[PDB]
């Protein structure tokens, strides 16, 4: 009929979008994900939701999805809507390898999704994707990369980015402490644990509330290391040691 339909497609009298601005605000009331470049690596960090003591966590990865062979992605927003995009995106990267027998070079994979995510804001009365998600990877042409998907379909290549209304103060922190040029892995891991100390309001940074995955180009393999919870512990205590130097000035 006519009186039963939703709008999903109609401009404002001033020109803005009515439904797209709403989906870009539900992601801010969700989890926290970030990434950081290095000279010889790239990493991802995530926030655990539903840390109740009657769960299993047998998947070895919840926010991170190792997608082709040398790329992975975090996720944020509606978790039920998110599984449709990941099964498609692994399937886009795999039909490319059937076509050329070369891995997908980490940009036109993203534009292939961003055309699919765009198309529900256009023709067809359907609900848009309420999912923004990160990107890490390596190619022959540029190397280590980060990208920033949006419900609108916009993408940007960032050096250090994060999520907004949940952790918008981190972006103000990353402009203060991420120094250009030298950004190596031990410097980048200690920078990442400093940021989640403030944004996650849980004191002492319990290791069951975080998740860190990395990527190093190593001897022509491009391993993707989801580092276990045993070495999260000593990475926290290294940052816990930095309070002792932080009180020497006073």
């Amino acid at each position: 009929s006519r009186r039963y339909d939703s709008r999903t497609t109609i401009f404002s009298p001033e020109g803005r979008l009515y439904q797209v601005e709403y989906a870009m605000e539900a992601i801010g009331h969700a989890g926290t994900c970030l990434g950081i470049l290095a000279n010889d690596g790239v990493l991802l960090a995530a926030e655990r939701r539903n840390i109740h003591k009657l769960l299993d966590e047998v998947f070895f990865s919840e926010k991170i999805y190792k997608l082709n062979e040398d790329m992975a992605c975090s996720v944020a927003g509606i978790t039920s809507d998110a599984n449709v995009l990941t099964n498609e995106l692994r399937l886009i990267a795999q039909r490319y390898l059937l076509q050329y027998q070369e891995p997908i070079p980490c940009e036109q994979l993203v534009t292939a999704l961003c055309d699919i995510k765009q198309a529900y804001t256009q023709f067809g009365g359907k609900r848009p994707f309420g999912v923004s998600l990160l990107y890490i990877g390596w190619d022959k042409h540029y190397g280590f990369q980060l990208y920033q998907s949006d419900p609108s379909g916009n993408y940007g290549g960032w050096k250090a980015t994060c999520i907004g209304n949940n952790s918008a103060a981190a972006v103000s922190m990353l402009k203060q402490d991420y120094k250009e040029g030298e950004m190596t892995l031990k410097s980048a891991l200690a920078l990442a644990i400093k940021v989640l100390n403030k944004t996650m309001d849980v004191s002492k940074l319990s290791a069951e509330k975080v998740e860190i995955a990395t990527l190093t180009r190593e001897n022509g393999k491009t391993v993707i290391r989801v580092l276990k919870q045993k070495e999260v512990e000593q990475l926290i205590k290294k940052h816990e040691e930095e309070e002792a130097k932080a009180e020497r000035e006073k």
Partner: protein
């Protein structure tokens, strides 16, 4: 025939704790060779290979379609593939072209991903699985390869004698064939390592 358009020979053989696979190197049209570096053995995960023989179009085609389905399988599940599971996967792919069939006969050889248990099987051009315990052969010069393996095979063999048995089986049978030859490559795998050797064969 259509199978005799390019030639080929793929042999697999089961040992004690190890398994070996071998193939030829000649690529060519009916009587004219082209090159001696045509790959017919493709790795599908660690400690598990596959060999293809038949029409050279369907060798390169099925090995890409099977690689298309393997990577989608190993990402929905964190585990690797079992050797019984790949045999059911290939038999599904060949049977979909029931009346438009691919002209190849696959040979699968590999170990168990958990235990050390070897596995060999071969399929027809429409997907009939057939597991054995000693050897499987495929290609144009099939009847010469049965004559060598029925007399030289021993049940429990170290990787030393298993390499020497599959070497003499491939050299003496392919030299009797006309449209196969120009080099033989041998893969011998085990729990600890993978050894690849090429043999000194007649180049005529």
């Amino acid at each position: 025939s259509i199978m005799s358009y390019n030639g080929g020979a793929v042999m697999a053989m089961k040992g004690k704790n190890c398994v070996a696979i071998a193939a030829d190197r000649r690529f060519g049209i009916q009587a004219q060779m082209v090159t001696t570096d045509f790959q017919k053995i493709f790795p599908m995960g660690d400690r598990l290979y596959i060999g293809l023989a038949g029409l050279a179009t369907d060798v390169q085609t099925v090995a890409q379609r099977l690689k298309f389905r393997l990577n989608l399988y190993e990402l929905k599940e964190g585990r690797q593939i079992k050797p019984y599971t790949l045999m059911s996967m290939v038999a599904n792919l060949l049977y979909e072209k029931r009346f438009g069939p691919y002209y190849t006969e696959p040979v699968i050889a590999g170990l168990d991903p958990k235990t050390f248990k070897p596995f060999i099987c071969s399929l027809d051009l429409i997907g009939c699985p057939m597991v054995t315990d000693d050897f499987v052969v495929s290609g144009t010069c099939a009847e010469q390869m049965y004559g060598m393996c029925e007399s030289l095979w021993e049940p429990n063999m170290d990787p030393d004698h298993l390499f020497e048995t599959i070497s003499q089986a491939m050299l003496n049978a392919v030299d009797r064939d006309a449209v196969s030859g120009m080099g033989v490559i041998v893969h011998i795998i085990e729990k600890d390592k993978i050894t690849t050797r090429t043999l000194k064969a007649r180049m005529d």
